[PDB]
């Protein structure tokens, strides 16, 4: 749909399809994201139940509807300030040895003759690192893996209620069971004026928000570097940092995000009435030719690279520095372990928002 995308960007970067409004241009998708005032993220009834939550009135509810993600300032900023430095430069500088050692061990388990790197490398790494960071017992990998499906970006589909409930019952219990044996990060949350529910949500957010996305970043990277035969250049020119930024732009783990107009607003040449949901196509903004010359091309050394794969504005991905650091250590250690990589088989996860692979079978020559 990147062609329809290029088409619409030219003719209708802010279009209405009957039900929802969609924004495909870079200038306008960025505008939406940065103007939280007109385009609110208060889409799960958090702002409406804050008081009753803090009142103790609301006692039970799906905890995931109350996290910084689905909230506007000040609430958002108050919640966010509690973990603002969790992925700070020095902190990441220090996890480096852990991340690299961890990726190297994961690589050590790969059978070059033929293996799936999604299963052996892409999935575990982020989970293992976030547990370390959050202080949540890693001996619960198989479960963290399952609950990672609950990430907000993913939307619903028929007959999933019983499955989701089950994952939800276990996930919550796990959190409840570990709320006090975690790092400063969670303690601060646990020891705040947040309701019991919001703390639950806050904790689940930090736990699962970057698993599937970071995994996808790693998978999509391996794919693009391979299909575009850039492994040699990347190693030679050391374009790891730049190439992962291009992978993010070209192959975004999250294709889009959503907002709701908190009022009647004119975006470009259109007037989006109050209360309208607005689809922000991150994938399309990333291809915007006005901003990204030769956007249809994968330029491994593209610089600069102002993509919106982590968003923009106040909700700009909290884990961005971490996702970047993890994918880059994974891509480097992977690239130094094989002479040549051959994609033998793939399986793509089915979702219009989440974009990556369920399976990535390859053959490596050490
Ligand atoms: C490379 C993979 C990743 C991608 C592409 C991604 C993408 C995004 C995007 C698009 C947003 C903004 C959503 C919006 O504006 O509605 C976001 C928010 C967020 N991300 Fe990620 N993410 C990734 C990795 C991570 C990691 C590793 C973590 C770590 C736990 C994480 C934590 C968060 C949090 C907490 C927010 C909400 C912050 C706020 O609302 O201010 N993300 N992410």
Cβ atoms of 312 and 255 closer than 8 Å? no
List strands edge to edge, sheet with 21-23. 14-16, 21-23, 277-280, 257-261, 39-40
Q: What tokens appear for 137 in the block?
A: 């017992």
H or E stretch covering 220 = helix 211-227
φ and ψ at 189, to 5 degrees? -70, -50
Residue 94 assigned ligand-binding role: no
Cβ atoms of 329 and 265 closer than 8 Å? no
Which residues, judged by CB distance below 6 Å to any ligand atom, belong to the binding site of ligand 1? 41, 68-69, 80, 205-206, 209-210, 213-214, 217, 253-254, 257, 309-311, 314-315, 317-319, 322-323
Q: What tokens appear for 249 in the block?
A: 């732009």
Report the C-alpha gap between 269 and 330 in whole angstroms: 44
Cβ atoms of 321 and 210 closer than 8 Å? no
Contacting residues for 256 by C-beta, under 8 A, at least 6 apart: 279, 280, 281, 282, 283, 352, 353
Cα angle value 348/352/353 (rounded, 5°): 100
Report the 10 Å Cβ neighbour count for 317.
18
φ and ψ at 55, to 5 degrees? -80, -20
> Alpha-carbon Rg of the chain, whole angstroms?
21
Residue 257 assigned ligand-binding role: yes
List strands edge to edge, sheet with 115-116. 115-116, 357-365, 340-348
Report the 10 Å Cβ neighbour count for 15.
15
Give the burial string for 165-187 (b: 16+ CB within 10 Å, else e). eebbeebbebbeebbeebeebbe
Contacting residues for 56 by C-beta, under 8 A, at least 6 apart: 195
Strands 39-40 and 115-116: unpaired
Q: Counting atoms of ligand 1 from 1, which one is nearest the CA of 126?
A: 27
| Residue 334: Cβ-neighbour burial (10 angstroms; 0-12, 13-18, 19+) | buried
Q: What tokens appear for 164 in the block?
A: 């989701």
Cβ atoms of 114 and 361 closer than 8 Å? yes
Which experimental approach was used here? X-ray
Cα angle value 350/331/256 (rounded, 5°): 35
Residue 328 assigned ligand-binding role: no
Q: What tokens appear for 143 in the block?
A: 């479960």
Polymer length of the chain: 366
- Of residues 61, 40, 80, 43, the one with CA closest to residue 195: 61
> Tokens 């369920």 — which residue?
358
CA 108 from centroid of its chain's CA atoms:
27
Report the C-alpha gap between 240 and 218 in whole angstroms: 12
Strands 270-272 and 265-267: antiparallel
Q: Counting atoms of ligand 1 from 1, which one is nearest the CA of 70?
A: 40
Strands (E), 37-155: 39-40, 115-116
φ and ψ at 217, to 5 degrees? -55, -45
Strands 115-116 and 357-365: antiparallel
| Domains of the chain with CATH codes | 1-366 (1.10.630.10)
- Which residue's alpha carbon is at the smallest distance from atom 19 of ligand 1? 317
Ligand 1 mutation target, pool 205, 245, 318, most atoms within 8 A of CB: 318
Q: How far from each other are the two terminal CA atoms of the chain, in whole angstroms? A: 37
- Which residue's alpha carbon is at the smallest distance from atom 39 of ligand 1? 315
Cβ atoms of 234 and 300 closer than 8 Å? yes
């Amino acid at each position: 749909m990147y062609d329809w995308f290029s088409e619409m960007r030219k003719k209708d970067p802010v279009y209405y399809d009957g039900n929802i409004w969609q924004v495909l241009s870079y200038r306008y998708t960025k505008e939406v994201l940065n103007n939280f005032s007109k385009f609110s993220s208060d889409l799960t009834g958090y702002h409406e139940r804050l008081e009753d939550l803090r009142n103790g009135k609301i006692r039970f509810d799906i905890p995931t509807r109350y996290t910084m993600l689905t909230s506007d300032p000040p609430l958002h900023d108050e919640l966010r300030s509690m973990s603002a430095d969790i992925f700070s430069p020095q902190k990441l500088q220090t996890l480096e040895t852990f991340i690299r050692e961890t990726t190297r061990s994961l690589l050590d388990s790969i059978d070059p003759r033929e293996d799936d790197i999604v299963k052996k490398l892409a999935v575990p790494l982020p989970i293992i690192v976030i547990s370390k960071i959050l202080g949540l017992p890693i001996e619960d990998k198989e479960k963290f893996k399952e609950w990672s499906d609950l990430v907000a970006f993913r939307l619903g589909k028929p007959g999933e209620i019983f499955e989701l409930g089950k994952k939800y019952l276990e996930l919550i219990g796990y959190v409840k069971d570990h709320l006090n044996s975690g790092t400063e990060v969670v303690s601060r949350v646990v020891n705040s004026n947040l309701s019991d529910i919001e703390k639950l949500g806050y904790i689940i957010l930090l736990l699962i928000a970057g698993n599937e996305t970071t995994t996808n970043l790693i998978s999509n990277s391996v794919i693009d570097f391979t299909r575009f035969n850039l492994w040699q250049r990347i190693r030679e020119e050391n374009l790891y940092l730049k190439a992962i930024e291009e992978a993010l732009r070209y192959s975004p783990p999250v294709m889009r995000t959503v907002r709701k107009t908190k009022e009647r607003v004119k975006l470009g040449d259109q007037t989006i009435e109050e209360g309208e949901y607005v689809r922000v196509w991150i994938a399309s903004a990333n291809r915007d030719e006005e901003v990204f010359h030769d956007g249809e091309k994968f330029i491994p050394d593209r610089n600069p690279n102002p993509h919106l794969s982590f968003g923009s504005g106040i909700h700009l991905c909290l884990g961005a520095p971490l996702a970047r650091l993890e994918a880059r250590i994974a891509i480097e250690e992977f690239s130094k372990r094989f002479r040549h990589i051959e994609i033998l088989d793939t399986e793509k996860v089915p979702n219009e928002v989440l974009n990556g692979y369920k399976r990535l079978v390859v053959r490596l020559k050490s």
